[PDB]
């Protein structure tokens, strides 16, 4: 069927022309919760609408700060590579994590003690890039798809520092003299970027492993996320990945939460910083309390980018008949929240009564466990 | 069918869950021609992506530099009215540009000299409000709909400066004196705005027209575009409104453009200012030339804004089957363009072979006489 | 009697119409010392100068940036509340640091992990709640009245998250299945935010105690200063709480000073950051020397806002008759003040001699011994 | 010899390595006046601390807000065109203002109604493009070098918008339906920008000028300025080029100075804008007075660039045994100034002696008449 | 001879008045690199092309962001004392790192719970003054000439806060009820700053330390940076003082680097924060790897500031006959690069070798070990 803007007595059928798709897949923005109130920002955007950069060997495409302006920093790479194929050399002022969505990659790092790490990333695996340190990504067999997130908003993908850009604009003399050869031992060198090249397969990944005089590095930069016990609530589960458990990743704190259909993303906010989202896959609603009494509601689905603003409360309910899955992304050491409910299970009955105008049949039904994913009765 | 982001060599499937609608209207985002290059920020923005402001005899949503960061100095809401239905008496600091895209309207407004304009608005017709100056807008028989530009890309529709909200918040006995009232015959005045509300239907113009001591105004605050003789050439037609024939419109001048199937906006730049784009019907793509090998082509169609940084060069390339109609919006009191074939038909023909490598068989097809709009051979 | 800005022979009377008795409070700004020079921006305003939001249950009135400039980092807020006045359950980005100046009040709080503290604070006592961490005040039998300090100057009273705005502003489905219960068993939720409500008085302390399954938080969020044991100098006290002794207080260092009749806080500046002052009680002057032989002197009174742009010099002289206390504000983790005679008393007495021009006579009476506030011989 | 930064009894010998040459260059940078007092930010840059693009064909090398701060409107560029060469056709956001120091050259603009303007530019003419409008220069049988100024001091001399690589990143089908060509008549484009070409000698001016359907432009982009008459006091000459004489010119006002051996710019100001200045040949000393007693001495010579804060005080000195000559640029639509001496002279005799404690045989030397260029007695 | 910048068929004579002996000092710049490319910011400024402030008893001359607008985070200041002269006790919001090049001097500083450090410093020694904290120089015998670097690039030499301008604008009766003395036995304190001033030479250092109620100071706030071990490579020694071994050095990492005559600063990037870089002796030029292919070579020589914003790329050549000797300034708590040579050594060679089209006869050159300084062979 065809959407219309009324919710009761309010609002109208459209009358210019218009985008019936998307009005499909925003039904609460199209139609709002009569809750909503007030100007808030824009907390949604799609990498589907943005331009995909193309090369040999796959292809990527970013979501920053001049697509969803809010973002100021964080930013983010939808990245895909074929199989054997190689993400250059590289290295930025931004640190990078990442979530493997699909598929399985090699990365390399070296760190500034000329100490590398090498290691294979499956599916739910994450990696951490430290600001400024030189990494790589080859994707092995199954090819590989994940997503990037960078702790600057500003980030832009096309201005990373690569190995053979840095080369093809160093004078050959200077270059030469770096490593103690001629000039023409090294005429060869690539006149531009590769940026992403195909290339074979590697081999296994003990026979790539570097031994050096330097040590092995004190904390890994991989960790595998879904190998980690869940917090198991009613209607989801919730694993927390942040500088206290993945030792390295001192910039990134993320959460992966999936929501069974029926459940909710219960009411929470976050203490410490904002809330940059992903979502991997399913369809999602949430509202934003924005204080002064503003409020709005956005919709969501895989590929889209969510954010929230700094202690801003909300709640992310499944609306589709698949489990809903997305990232919780936070530019900070910890991982926190405040739940609604474990907050007002803590205070006295009768003030939590004195505040909500209700009676002793509310608060018997807190609950002073925190459940940060919730199943509908 | 299903597409992909392959072009060529280049490319890869997509493997993680995705947005296959979105994907379907954006060809040349997910698939970008092999001449795009380098960051260029998003220029591109869907009215169905906003969150719509629901009333009695209406709604309203905005695109505002909340959404689209780039437009800093333009933004823009899409409203609607249902029959007799009013936008409440109000003013802002920003002007107001407007293009009734669906029914008809009447539009009030009191300038500072005290003198009153009231008028009707139809389908293709425009209104400009100077800033500061008190409007209303009440739709009659057939509702209406239409698309209103401010000059401040920063604009908040919620925090226009309405009649009753004023009157809501001033002190009852300021309201009493400066009418020369008591509080008593004021005691009705309502509590809180109204924004939009359902009203009978007015009589006709005429019976409203309120004759005053201080004269009619100078110039008109309404204009009858499409009663204009447009720009003809071979693919379509540009009628241009702007402060040199729609006298008051000081601060926004407009084109409306019609692009016949398989014509297009040629290659031009604006000398003078930024573009802003509204997309009113059928689809288009669009390249954004940035200087610096920088490039990026951009999708939309009905319902979209888009946008273009001054001087940057571009076309508007109908790809669609029906015709494709848009607005070019200019934050200056004049329209000016410069064409790439008129530009080089002007110059030696020696002097342009120079530069292109070119030969007599280019040259000989260039064109002294502007044509906004080409047709394919 | 009428002062006149007359400084021997500078200065003439006033001419015009005048405000006598703002003049008659500001004796060293109408007639500054000889020694003033420069442009100096503002560091000095009184909450009698604002707004005062009036509820049930008491007011509330700010001092932002909006109204003192300078103060880029840190606000304040003068709160009371009547006898058993609730200033409703809520949350803020910024953190609160407070001292009660009248009466007393029980604080609840519950942190990340769902610990709960409750606690009683009287006259002389301080609170702290860390940013994003969510908060009650209530008053006891004798009502309260008390200063908070945000961390950031651009912090807004009206703008904190509220729990029944919040619960206003979310669907009430959303609401029912968060926390199990039907749209009916919520139907009487408040429609808007209460902030300050008349409330009967709570009982005993102990009976409010809410025990957890979460423990004990690890740090208390109150602090007796007035039972610390002070510095004492011979003309006054001074009372220190910063995160080293109140180790919540990570954000926010203070000091209690009172200083006797003929008494003043000698000339020191802070090495680490600005200082934000209060005046509670008494009558004081301040010189600010800003470098560049740029210098200017204040005047305050019970209820004014002071500030001290990091590193500046200066001294507050008591210049009434009653002990002049006021409070001493840093956003930082320690407290730390150079004092000018301890500086000088520990270095050569020749070196010291070669920079003023003065004798063994001189350099005699330096103390080693630091002493925050002096006695007039 | 050997320069020392002493000044009577204060300064030092230097004892640290040095740079002998620029201490040469600079002696009243090294040895400053003893008037000199305060923190004034740096008006001095010389275009042989930039780095030299060097092309077939030329050269350019440019001064901006990257390296003289100082300077946010206004940016210019050192160009260079050996006989034939071209400057590729191209276009930018700010206008463009020129001097021809060496040779001559040609120019091509197209305006926004598709008139075109082409001319022939000898040493000491001049040129403006407004912003936006398309333009080239090609050197004639001498090659060109000439001095550009930009109405934007953050202009970029690499990101001009070229006919070249506008095609090149433009879809070749694009390409192809704008010129109503097939894609093989285009095949050969160059792929990538020219900016600076070798190429033949042009003909005749007469034979190049292109008749068109739309009119001579009505203003010329072109001015002889050495052939209008100066200003001609007693140590120099000054010719002023603005918007009231150079039509076009709006955003740019000019004055090109010689001043004699001996001879000085009098003591003035500039009561509308900032002044920015390219010493073309000869050494000179000025003084900027910055008012709050602020003031620095500044030293150029050929290839420096400087300027004046808006409203500043100043002089420039000839302190070289060859003429100085140099310009004055100003954005702004006239030029202004207002002169000490004649400021003075406009007033009573004893007000001014009253002022500068001096007598009739001071007032009695003064001059109503303006003489922007004095000669030592 | 005269240089032009000529390179192959690239660019022409110089044909205006020019700057020889600049041009002369920037063989790289009037004649870049071609592997050069794009728009980089001014990393490049002189401190003879500063004003110098003499004072009786040396001078001191500043490079800030106002003249060199890339380094916002760092400015630096050159200073001379003749023997026994005095730098006025002061201090400042910024901290204070300092090499001493020439002489020897004596410091005070009183931390801020009231204990003194005297130390005396000679050639290649350190001193760091943590932000706020008074200190004072004095020259012994040979004077002294150094280095100041502070961690505020808007850093202003003239703001500082000084003992005797503080006290010159500070009520005199305040003074005299500060210490406890009489307005007339304080009469002949200076009316004005100091700043410099000559005094006798001072006693040996151990009759200068100042016994205290208060403890010797945790850290030394000097260090011997020569008499460490340094890294010795084939060309060059670099010596590191951070926070690590330089224990109250919190805000500045430092490395003095001497290359040999034919040796070069290895290519190398920093991953933690821009360098700021002083020329203390010898001829050197430097490329900067700006990424996306920009790249941009500068000279420079003793007197020389130059700058290396965050991660970019960069190698430093000597280019002359003596030694180089520079400085490596970071605001950071710790050093830290990453070389080209060891990050590529402890990768798989067959890796390395798919990046840079190059084989086994390359990769076997690779070095694990880290060699800041090479020798061309
Ligand atoms: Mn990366
Ligand atoms: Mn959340
Ligand atoms: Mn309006
Ligand atoms: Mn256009
Ligand atoms: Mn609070
Ligand atoms: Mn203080
Ligand atoms: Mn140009
Ligand atoms: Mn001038
Ligand atoms: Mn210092
Ligand atoms: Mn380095």
Known sequence: DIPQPIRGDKGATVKIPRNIERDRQNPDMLVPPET????????????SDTHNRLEKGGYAREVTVRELPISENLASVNMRLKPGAIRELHWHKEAEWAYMIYGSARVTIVDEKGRSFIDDVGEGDLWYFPSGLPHSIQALEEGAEFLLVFDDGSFSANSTFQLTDWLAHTPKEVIAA???????????????????????????????????????????????????????????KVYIADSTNFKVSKTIASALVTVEPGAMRELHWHPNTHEWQYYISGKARMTVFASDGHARTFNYQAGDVGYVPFAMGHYVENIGDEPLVFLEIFKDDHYADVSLNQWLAMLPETFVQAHLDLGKDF???LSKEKHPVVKKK
């Open 36 to 47: 909503d109130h007030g100007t808030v920002s824009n907390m949604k955007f799609s990498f």
């Open 178 to 236: 770096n490593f103690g050869v001629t000039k023409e031992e090294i005429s060869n060198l690539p006149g531009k970027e590769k940026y992403i090249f195909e290339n074979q397969l590697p081999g296994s990944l003990k026979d790539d492993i570097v031994e050096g005089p330097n040590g092995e590095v004190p904390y890994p930069f991989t960790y595998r996320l879904l190998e980690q016990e869940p917090i198991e609530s009613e209607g989801g």
């Open 363 to 365: 608060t018997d039904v």
